[PDB]
Amino acid sequence: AIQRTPKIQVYSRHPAENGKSNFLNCYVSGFHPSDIEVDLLKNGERIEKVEHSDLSFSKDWSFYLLYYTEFTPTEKDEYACRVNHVTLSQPKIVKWDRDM
Amino acid sequence: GAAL
Amino acid sequence: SHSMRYFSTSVSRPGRGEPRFIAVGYVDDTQFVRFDSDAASPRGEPRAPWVEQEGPEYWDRETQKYKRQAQTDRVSLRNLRGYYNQSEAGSHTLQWMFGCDLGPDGRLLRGYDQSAYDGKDYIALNEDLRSWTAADTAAQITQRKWEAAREAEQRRAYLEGTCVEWLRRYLENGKETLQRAEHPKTHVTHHPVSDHEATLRCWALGFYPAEITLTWQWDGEDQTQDTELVETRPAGDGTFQKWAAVVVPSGEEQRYTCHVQHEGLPEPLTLRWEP
Ligand SMILES: *C(=O)CCCCCCCCCCCCC
């Protein structure tokens, strides 16, 4: 069957400001089939109390999901999203860029 | 309803 | 026009039990309900404040419909595997989307109901809400079954009545968020990438509903082939975000314009990098 790989975006809800509480988002979209695993990472380690949306899909039948957590941007901590899907031989890591 |  | 739309997905897992069923419902781009047959407690659950007040009868009623549809989808997946002569070993997906658009008389403007198998169009209710379009000879079997079962008349009755009546109720109870467009808040950023090129990134933030157009022009000529356009994404607070970027010759930035279209804007917006 169809196997479309997720488009993975890692981003903050509000413009990032160091020391101001925000939300860290990992959005996966455009994928098929729907089984997928998503972790948010801080300094390489899994953030645990991460929430997520419910499985939905777009006009072209591809799926999308939002994973998110409260976080505080800092100068030196590294935030990322890790995704596994049948289209990936190993989990894909996307590091947060504050202007993407 | 009906199945496909 | 305003719309109510329901989405469902069933996924089989041969050898690991029966298929999983996940359903969600939306008014416009705002989710209000979810159901997951694999959830810790498989019940219809609220996902918007303007549906939290509905009584236990509403939630019992909706939960029973979801459980029945999950059971029906299991049969459909079994039938589809037969139609296409597929092995018992493979996992497959059945998706359904249906909904109603609200017309200016408070009644149905248009209805839609469509199904996909393994991510490809399968059968759809036509605009007349009376006839079906089948994608292939397998879906023509379904078409014949549903004509004999008078299925379209059932779907039409829901779309014309219950769907529009509840869409109107939700629009009133959640009016201070559902009947409010939020325009995009925009800005353009600039990132040199070499000694003579730079990225221009056009941002749209905080907008609702989700539909938006973001395009870059050079000397008024659209540059879509050379534009990196991310998928429209949820901010998590009910609003959406998007950006579009082009790599441009440094010193030509003034010749590039970002164009934004959204229902919350009185006219299309034209932007430039200003620093
Ligand atoms: C067949 O006549 C049994 C009726 C049960 C189906 C209830 C309506 C379908 C459920 C819709 C919600 C799930 C799809 C989003």
Numbering used by the authors:
A (entry chain B): 0 to 99
B (entry chain C): 2 to 5
C (entry chain A): 2 to 276
Paper passage:
These HLA class I molecules shared a serine at position 9 (Ser9) with Mamu-B∗098, in contrast to most MHC class I molecules that harbor a larger amino acid residue, such as tyrosine, at this position. Thus, we concluded that the structural flexibility of the large B pocket of HLA-A∗2402 and HLA-C∗1402 primarily accounted for their previously unrecognized capacity to bind such chemically distinct ligands as conventional peptides and N-myristoylated lipopeptides.
Peptide-induced and lipopeptide-induced complex formation in a buffer system was observed for HLA-C∗14:02, whereas lipopeptide-induced, but not peptide-induced, complex formation was affected by the Ser to Tyr (S9Y) mutation at position 9. The hydroxyl group of the side chain of Ser9 was positioned away from the B pocket cavity by establishing a hydrogen bond with Asp74, thereby contributing to the creation of an ample cavity with a hydrophobic surface, suitable for accommodating the myristoyl group.
